[PDB]
Design a protein around this ligand. Structure first.
Ligand code: NAD
Ligand code: NAD
Ligand code: GFB
Ligand code: GFB
Lengths: 316, 316
């Protein structure tokens, strides 16, 4: 089966690429290398089952070309950074709504049979139902990013129904692990790289979120892809997160523990009642019962995932 | 209070404009007249409280100017035609997501406190729960149009939370009445103008939908707007439709009745099981309990509204 993996040079994208290549898929990657890295996939450069394309999905010619002779598309290309939503909503609109729109228009005029899209928990915004099921609503995202992911979901479904392809929407929790160049663990480790004595923590440290290690993330993505191929649903929605959650302050504590530092915590106090930023959901914990009915389940919890991530990262 | 009404030269927009002028609002209209007409609002030209701006919302300067010195925005500008979704998805993308995105970017740099958006039942797609409540989900629109409307909703919510304005999203059912230049009644009347002996009905004729007369529609929009001004929700969702529904075949029968014709109905059999087109939802009926708790209620049911619309149209 031939698959396009947009953003396949990214953190999650390159791991999905490793998995797909190892299972014998013929994998093309489409990535402008604005945030991913060629190194993250240099092992596959030169494999006869691997093709790489440096390309911006804003460019429709590129996107029509990349989906040509592809049976499945895994659309992971995006700017995932919620932080930049209050300064750079245009960037989030483009790299979430626009490039997905172009991908779908390309998909319409091709033989692409399956579209797997990595949406986010942020579509629920500050969800009042915990653990949050996939049918929670009304969806009132509080960040430009979550709104852009919701819009991507909507357009994916509409094109799937109108132009007769199948679509699998996977709302991911916080995903952490080796090769990640963004997030709170990364930033804590590098802040302490620059100064071991203090840790500037955005917000009040009480933000509690579900963290999944990238290993469980890819196992679950593949399990859902497997089940979805065997299923009949035109469009299917799954949450993908861990069973529990952990606070920003506890994450700072684990990162300090693993770095053998004991710095002075300095919280910025946040906004909208201690959020790290405008649109930073304070509580997130996804109901993964629907995902677990496929056989998947995380082998690590949020605390284990965070600690393993810190270790893996400090090796590099 | 000064309010902008984008698309205010349209069917629903021009009636909303009439209403706003009569209640003493200061009304600016922004409309490129791609589907509306100056006739529909030329009656107000020369009033000290009325300003009209001919402009396409794709142009960001136009929209930035229009929200200048406006306290509330009624964003009715769009292409509402679902039928063209499989032919012209780019057009729906532009006139639903793009110009909504531009309006929102304009609103961020303004003093607009309230944004009211005319969403559609199509966001629910083929809803499996009927009457469909505002919290039905997962939202899986089956049309490019419904997907674009949902994406617009998402961006509205995200920007409302991020940049501190409030948003009222009103999911309208099928709206019918004077000045309507689209829909099934319009097309059936013109079909029988060209040939009174026969009527081509798209689909299998069993499509059952909730119709609201434009009078009830504007009464409800104003009730909801006032109540929303009195409420605390940063973003609030309301259905706006009738209590009942009616099939396309009964609408054909009523149109024949009022035209004193009795033609031969010829149903085209449709697609995807008798739909009028790719992405045409077959059954629609929104739960209006939430709308009715504001005091609003339709004075006409679907059959009365359809008959009133046909009569009004035939006077012209
Ligand atoms: N990391 C998480 O915690 C997390 C959580 C939930 C959802 N997700 C989603 O999973 C997916 C993968 O995220 P990630 O952590 O691997 O991020 P990433 O930025 O590391 O990977 C995304 C890739 O997209 C590429 N890209 C950016 N703009 C592009 C464009 N215009 N055209 C082509 N390629 C472009 C980047 O260069 C990068 O290689 C995204 O959809 C993200 O929103 C991530
Ligand atoms: N008619 C219905 O049954 C119905 C149902 C649900 C929702 N809605 C929504 O209500 C609103 C009004 O629909 P309507 O029936 O009055 O349609 P309409 O076309 O009569 O009115 C929409 C207006 O948008 C204007 N417009 C179109 N493209 C524009 C652009 N690029 N820039 C600026 N203005 C532009 C048109 O000229 C028109 O005046 C729309 O948002 C529509 O999607 C309508
Ligand atoms: C659900 C996922 O959310 C992901 O964002 P997101 O949760 O903020 O994930 P992070 O950026 O890791 O931030 C997680 C939490 O840690 C807080 N935090 C505290 N200090 C810091 C710091 O120094 N840096 C950062 N970055 N955070 C910090 C942050 O505000 C939030 O409460 C997205 O990247 C994905 O695309 C996806 O949307
Ligand atoms: C909910 C609202 O739905 C509205 O569309 P939508 O339901 O198709 O409303 P109409 O365009 O009126 O079509 C209503 C039903 O009548 C069918 N139909 C049968 N024959 C005809 C015909 O000759 N012409 C037309 N036009 N329809 C016909 C049509 O496919 C559908 O099943 C949108 O205009 C609004 O923006 C909003 O989305």
């Amino acid at each position: 089966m031939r698959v396009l993996v947009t953003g396949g040079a990214g953190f999650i994208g390159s791991h999905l690429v490793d998995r797909l290549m190892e299972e014998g898929y013929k994998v093309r990657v489409l990535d402008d290398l604005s945030a991913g890295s060629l190194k993250n996939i240099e092992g596959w450069l030169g494999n006869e089952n691997f093709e790489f394309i440096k390309g911006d999905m804003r460019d429709v010619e590129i996107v029509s070309k990349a989906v040509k002779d592809v049976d499945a598309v895994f659309h992971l290309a995006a700017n995932p950074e919620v932080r930049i939503g209050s300064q750079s909503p245009e960037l989030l609109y483009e790299t979430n709504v626009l490039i997905t729109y172009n991908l779908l228009n390309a998909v319409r005029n091709s033989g692409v049979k399956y579209l797997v899209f990595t949406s986010s928990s942020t579509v629920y915004g500050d969800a009042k139902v915990i653990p949050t099921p996939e049918d929670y609503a009304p969806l009132e995202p509080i960040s430009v990013f979550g709104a852009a992911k919701l819009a991507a979901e909507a357009l994916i479904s509409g094109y799937a129904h109108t132009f007769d392809f199948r679509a699998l929407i996977i709302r991911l929790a916080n995903i952490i692990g080796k090769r990640s160049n963004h997030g709170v663990i990364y930033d804590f480790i590098n802040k302490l790289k620059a100064n071991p004595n203090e840790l500037e923590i955005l917000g009040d440290g009480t933000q509690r979120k579900s963290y999944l290690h990238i290993s469980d993330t890819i196992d679950g993505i593949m399990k859902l892809f497997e089940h979805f191929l065997n299923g009949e649903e035109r469009v299917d929605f799954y949450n993908l997160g861990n069973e529990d959650w952990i606070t920003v302050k506890e994450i700072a504590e684990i990162v300090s523990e693993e770095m053998n530092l004991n710095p002075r915590f300095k919280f910025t106090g946040g906004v909208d009642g201690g959020r790290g930023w405008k649109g930073d959901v304070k509580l997130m914990l996804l109901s993964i019962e629907k995902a677990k009915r496929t056989g998947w389940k995380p082998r690590m919890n949020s605390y284990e995932a965070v600690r393993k991530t810190v270790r893996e990262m400090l090796e590099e």
